Amino acid sequence: MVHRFRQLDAKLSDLKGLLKEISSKIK
Amino acid sequence: DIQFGKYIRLSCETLYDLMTQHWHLKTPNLVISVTGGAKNFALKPRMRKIFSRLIYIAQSKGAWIFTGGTHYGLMKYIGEVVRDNTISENVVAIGIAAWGMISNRETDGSFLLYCLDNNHTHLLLVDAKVRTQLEKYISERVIPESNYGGKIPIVCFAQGGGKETLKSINVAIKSKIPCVVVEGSGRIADVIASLVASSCVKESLLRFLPRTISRLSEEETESWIKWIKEVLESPHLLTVIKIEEAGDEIVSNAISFALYKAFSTNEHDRDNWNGQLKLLLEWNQLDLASDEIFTNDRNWESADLQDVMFTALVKDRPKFVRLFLENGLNLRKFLTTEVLRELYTNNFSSLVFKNLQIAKNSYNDALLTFVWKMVEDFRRGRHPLQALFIWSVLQNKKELSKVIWEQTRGCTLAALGASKLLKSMAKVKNDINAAGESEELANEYETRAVELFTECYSNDEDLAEQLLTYSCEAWGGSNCLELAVEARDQQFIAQPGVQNFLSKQWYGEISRDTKNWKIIMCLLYYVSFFTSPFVVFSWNVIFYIAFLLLFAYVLLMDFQKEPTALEIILYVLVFVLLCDEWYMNGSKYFSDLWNVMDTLAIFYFIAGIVFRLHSDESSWYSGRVIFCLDYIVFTLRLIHIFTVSRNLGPKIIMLQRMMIDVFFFLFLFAVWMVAFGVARQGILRKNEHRWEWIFRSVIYEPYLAMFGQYPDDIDGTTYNFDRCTFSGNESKPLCVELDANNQPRFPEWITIPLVCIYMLSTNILLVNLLVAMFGYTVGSVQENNDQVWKFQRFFLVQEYNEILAWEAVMKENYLVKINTKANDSSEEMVHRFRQLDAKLSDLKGLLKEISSKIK
Amino acid sequence: TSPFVVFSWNVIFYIAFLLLFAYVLLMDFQKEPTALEIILYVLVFVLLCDEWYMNGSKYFSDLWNVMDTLAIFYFIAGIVFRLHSDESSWYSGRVIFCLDYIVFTLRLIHIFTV
Amino acid sequence: NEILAWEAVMKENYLVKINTKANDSSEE
């Protein structure tokens, strides 16, 4: 499953990047 | 005093002066349960575990414990645990109680609205502030022999919240070094744990303690929120035992972390790092110390560390030893004559000293005397690393022994020597657990050496043998292989590499595994063939067989009155064999059975010669008989000779395991023989006055009965009077008792069933049972017999700079492999999911920050 | 006072008793009881007294106990035949003693279970 | 008396060990 959980972290990283981008947008 | 105990009963520092001298000694540490005991407390298993571990730690460190002592809830259990531990440094449980809640009050008085806890050793009466003042004074107390920079470090434990608990927490926080600790579960402790805004505080307080708040007035709850704000101002003093945690030694970790944080935040002890390191050394905290101190590479040159290092060696903290070595430390330079002298003179247990005495006196060995004289030389006032390893292993320090062994250059040799030392110490047995641990550690070191040698042989087969042949280099009298032999290391010698080396040596210069029969047929180029042990053994076997043939010919065909020259040659050959055995006399000649047997044979031969030379018929006949008896031993020596067959040796060795079964068989057989023979002889014969015939008819005939012979004088029809004699003036058995009519008198219906039963028991049942036992025995011990034969093969065969660096490289690779081996499996994911929650927490924090930004 | 030593003494005494019984049975068995046979009777009754102590427990529960009672009964019956002073009677008494000797010897199997 | 208390202590330790034994594995 380590192979497969590995897939999960990519979604979290992309979501964090988008969150930072939108935070820059508002401010 | 009190009966169920001194009670000062003072009103609201001076008490401490009297306490120190009159009653008990000073405290390296102190612990306080600030939270009071509710009328009803939830004593779930986790609380019980936490407080039992806390009490055990207090006993280990020897600290006072402060509690109310009302005999309700938590304090009841703490007192019970304290009493049980003290009965089985010492723990002291001082208690304080106000006269308001005491039901019965009397002025050596005895005691029957709270009831005082019985388990508390001491109690104080007041006509809570006194507790705070006493804690403040004890904190302010200055002692020079303190690793905490003085101040007598104090830790306060909180289990359940409340008004009194919050007041106590606040007053303690106002004073410095409170070191408050709050557990996960509690009426108000959960609030504090969750917090680490008025609206959020109100929400947490309501959800965690809903009912009590409604009773409280608005102003009072506002004041409580102010108190909680004051507590929340400084989070470094607060420490929380999170609920999710379920590991061991949680209490010790929490206490150590809180005390370390308090010491670090002093703002004047921050510059000093030795104190922090010593504090983290007292408590088993490796990761925290490594992260805080050694990682930064701030202010230490690694030269002073020696001091701290010494303490670890005496306090059994192997992980800190490894940490010091990794971060830079020359053990060779640190180890000096003075350091070793201090280590051996004082820190060395005298029990091991007398045990060394007894071990040396009981048995003498080269390495035992070497280590003995080394330790005496150190005590009275050269490979010091070996001395440190010996000191560590002797005291049975498992982990530190391995850590030290990792540094020795003679890895396998050191392991074998340690195993031999442990076995020799275990020989001297006085405690079961001590001997068990000694033998277990010796076996572990043996297995480690076997693995290391497997790697050595795999990497380089040709030169791995040089390690076995390589000498000690001052390590000890013997080398690796001899050291393994002395400790009876069947596992080590039974591995493929050592057996292959032994075979290659025994075959000699002859090319190995050419063909067995070619070498026999063959019986400078010739010198190499003629100097091999195989050929020498073949020649000796041939000579012995020829000697047996000559002995038989002289004994049977040509044995005249006067010694003939051929018999003189026989004498010369036997004395030549005696001279050959003179060489082996140097070793434990009487230890083994075959050696004593050969000495016996030689003695019998010389006695037979003495009879031979008398020249009298009755004397030289007895000499011939002596020679005949000696021939049996001389021939039976072939069984010992042929233990190297590789096909017969294991089977021959197996015979040693059948002795118990043979003894049981013989015991039953002898009992039955005696019973049956006595019964029959008494039944069918009168008084016998010839001793020989008693045993000839009681023992001999039943013994023959198992070989298919059937008794004849048991049936009247079969019985024949020709063999027997009425009187004793003859050499044949006495006749059966007769009657007035001159006929046999025995009933004949008693003897026949008896004989049938005896024959059934002996001929059939017993032998089949023996066969079954032999089958089970050969099945059970088949594998161990191979190891035993391989071990004896060493004796049977022996009867007739760059390498150091390469060993270091191989050992370094092996150590790197084994250290990371646990991480190689990586079958645990909890470790790894743990990583996920950090991202979610950071994302939630950023989300809250951006939400604050917009609003 | 160790049980090991007491057991060793009892085993030695039992072996000596067996030797004495065999000697009386084979070499010296005369018409009129001899003092040596009287000593043998005394020893057997001493063993009976010793078993009286173990009688308190489940004496008939185990096989060896009933076997020893049977042996004692056979011995006393053989005595009764022995004292009649008739050839046909004391010969049967000798046969009885011979049969009893088998049980007395076979008790060693039970004795050596430790 | 002392033996009884020592037995109680050992039994308490054993009970605490066994009760939390199922949680020790934590294979779920």
Ligand SMILES: CC(C)CCC[C@@H](C)[C@H]1CC[C@H]2[C@@H]3CC=C4C[C@@H](OC(=O)CCC(=O)O)CC[C@]4(C)[C@H]3CC[C@]12C
């Ligand atoms: C009076 C003499 C000259 C006549 C005897 C004839 C044979 C009975 C002797 C002569 C040489 C002997 C052999 C000399 C050397 C050996 C090797 C010896 O060891 C092994 O074969 C296995 C050793 C290993 O595997 O390590 C076993 C016996 C054998 C065949 C001996 C067995 C008996 C032999 C054939």
Ligand SMILES: CC(C)CCC[C@@H](C)[C@H]1CC[C@H]2[C@@H]3CC=C4C[C@@H](OC(=O)CCC(=O)O)CC[C@]4(C)[C@H]3CC[C@]12C
């Ligand atoms: C009749 C008396 C007066 C003279 C001696 C009779 C011979 C027939 C005896 C003497 C020495 C004996 C031999 C001693 C040693 C050996 C080797 C032994 O083992 C092997 O042959 C091979 C061993 C292996 O495979 O390792 C077999 C029996 C043999 C020939 C023995 C069998 C019979 C021998 C020749």
Ligand SMILES: CC(C)CCC[C@@H](C)[C@H]1CC[C@H]2[C@@H]3CC=C4C[C@@H](OC(=O)CCC(=O)O)CC[C@]4(C)[C@H]3CC[C@]12C
């Ligand atoms: C489990 C089985 C197979 C084992 C024992 C069976 C038989 C071998 C035994 C059991 C009882 C024995 C019998 C007991 C009594 C007698 C009578 C006996 O003759 C007399 O008693 C006459 C005495 C006299 O003349 O004074 C001859 C043998 C016989 C049949 C015995 C012979 C063998 C028998 C049949």
Ligand SMILES: CC(C)CCC[C@@H](C)[C@H]1CC[C@H]2[C@@H]3CC=C4C[C@@H](OC(=O)CCC(=O)O)CC[C@]4(C)[C@H]3CC[C@]12C
């Ligand atoms: C009249 C004649 C021809 C037959 C009887 C004489 C013997 C055959 C008798 C006398 C006493 C008997 C013995 C009394 C006690 C024992 C021990 C018993 O085995 C045990 O000791 C174990 C008992 C258990 O397992 O509990 C088996 C029978 C045996 C030999 C008995 C079998 C038959 C014996 C030897």
Ligand SMILES: CC(C)CCC[C@@H](C)[C@H]1CC[C@H]2[C@@H]3CC=C4C[C@@H](OC(=O)CCC(=O)O)CC[C@]4(C)[C@H]3CC[C@]12C
């Ligand atoms: C007429 C008498 C004096 C001569 C008999 C000579 C031996 C046959 C006797 C004398 C003392 C006996 C020994 C007395 C005590 C014991 C110990 C006894 O128990 C054990 O050895 C193991 C007990 C355990 O391990 O718990 C076994 C028999 C033995 C050796 C007895 C076996 C037979 C012995 C050697």
Ligand SMILES: FC(F)(F)c1ccccc1-c1cc(C(F)(F)F)c2[nH]c(C3=NOC4(CCCCC4)C3)nc2c1
């Ligand atoms: F392998 C074995 F042991 F035979 C055996 C194997 C399997 C089952 C039973 C036995 C066994 C055991 C015992 C005991 F355990 F009781 F000793 C026996 N005893 C006797 C007899 N007792 O006395 C006799 C000899 C003296 C004359 C009277 C008859 C034979 N036969 C037995 C058979």
Ligand SMILES: [Ca+2]
């Ligand atoms: Ca020899």
Ligand SMILES: [Ca+2]
């Ligand atoms: Ca009995």
